[PDB]
Amino acid sequence: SNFLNCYVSGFHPSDIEVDLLK
């Protein structure tokens, strides 16, 4: 349902838990 995921530039550390039912 209109899934728009954009990510620019990465990294080594940090924790990102992205969760989308769609």
> Which residues contact its own copies (rule: CB under 8 A)?
1-22
In the complex, minimum distance from the CB of residue 7 to its own copies, in angstroms, rounded to a whole number: 5
Cβ pair 3, 20 in contact under 8 A:
yes
In the complex, minimum distance from the CB of residue 20 to its own copies, in angstroms, rounded to a whole number: 5
The C-alpha angle with vertex 2 and arms to 5 and 11, in degrees rounded to 5, equals 5
In the complex, minimum distance from the CB of residue 17 to its own copies, in angstroms, rounded to a whole number: 5
